[PDB]
Amino acid sequence: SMVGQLSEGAIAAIMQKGDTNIKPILQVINIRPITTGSPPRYRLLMSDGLNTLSSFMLATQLNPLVEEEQLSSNCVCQIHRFIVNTLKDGRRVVILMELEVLKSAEAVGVKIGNPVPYNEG
């Protein structure tokens, strides 16, 4: 199945274990600029095939991937470096520092599988 291409379970692992050694393969579902007012910042809704999670921000060094439309919704990418930070109220956020587009949005064409929003509380 198409979801055989994605690292099922990696979103829960990122948010619960925080081991930055995994190099999960994820699908970009949506990309939205974050209000900045300056360098633009991009928020990503990501999927591991089981869950979606919108608490991803691109490092600014990766902005050209979005702006030159090499990283776009439906593409499949491998995360090679990320960090997790925890906010005062307990919410966790993921900063994507290095990644590789494995399959372009045009080659994938659709959201893979039926992922459901991650339950973070």
Partner: peptide, 14 residues
Amino acid sequence: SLSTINDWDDMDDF
């Protein structure tokens, strides 16, 4: 909310 850049970082926020 995570819709503004300040939301992503509390310790830089005064």
